[PDB]
Design a protein around this ligand. Structure first.
Ligand SMILES: Nc1nc2c(ncn2[C@@H]2O[C@H](COP(=O)(O)OP(=O)(O)O)[C@@H](OP(=O)(O)OP(=O)(O)O)[C@H]2O)c(=O)[nH]1
Ligand SMILES: [Zn+2]
Lengths: 142, 49
């Protein structure tokens, strides 16, 4: 369905061949393409946002509609900030792919599933370590 | 088979002042706010209708 992250690029889910080794040239190229498309899309969305923000902004004479026009901007900027935070993660993942050290958990040497990487291409840890770390985080935070 | 309770009626969310405005469901929250605030300031006319 044209709404996921494989949709952004014109790629369809990969399919590891019977005797296919784990990290080959083709998979790494695939993931690089995916990340590059995702990024370029996000940045073009930022450009849209900025053009909108630059066109709309005006001085309203009523205080109960200046708030109206500055309560949608807060949400918009929130989404843009979040995606900007994800642009650094994508950049780092692009650095691991270029360095040919992509696809393995940082805590334990186990390799992360291919299907999980096609799910969330920025994955840094395996599902088990991810869950444990998320629990430890949420517990140390609250 | 999981719902323990249910709202008594739709109006229970809002006060009387806001409850008097018709078609709140189609009004932005800010303008409902200002509407209620001024509506409570109305002066009685000569002949109520
Ligand atoms: N649009 C988008 N943004 C993402 C995505 N993934 C992560 N982000 C944003 O980048 C931030 C970095 O997240 P991480 O610290 O790496 O945590 P994570 O491993 O679970 O992704 C996230 O923090 P955060 O705490 O979740 O942000 P927030 O909850 O404080 O708003 C989030 O704001 C994503 O897939 N899509
Ligand atoms: Zn792990």
């Amino acid at each position: 369905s044209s709404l996921s992250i494989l949709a952004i690029a014109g790629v369809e889910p990969y399919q590891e061949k019977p005797g296919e080794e784990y990290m080959n040239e083709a998979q790494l190229a695939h993931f690089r393409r995916i990340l590059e498309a995702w990024r370029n899309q996000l940045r073009d969305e930022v450009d849209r946002t900025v053009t909108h923000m630059q066109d709309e902004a005006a001085n309203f004479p009523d205080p109960v509609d200046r708030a109206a026009q500055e309560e949608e901007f807060s949400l918009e900027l929130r989404n843009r900030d979040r995606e900007r935070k994800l642009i650094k993660k994508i950049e780092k993942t692009l650095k691991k792919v270029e360095d040919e050290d992509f696809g393995y958990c940082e805590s334990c040497g186990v390799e992360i599933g291919i299907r999980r990487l096609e799910a969330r291409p920025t994955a840094d840890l395996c599902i088990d370590c991810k869950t444990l770390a998320e629990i430890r985080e949420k517990q140390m935070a609250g | 088979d999981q719902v323990d309770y249910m709202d008594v009626s739709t109006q229970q969310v809002v006060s009387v002042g806001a409850s008097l405005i018709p078609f709140l469901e189609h009004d932005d929250a800010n303008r409902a706010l200002m509407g209620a605030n001024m509506q409570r300031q109305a002066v009685p006319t000569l002949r109520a209708d």
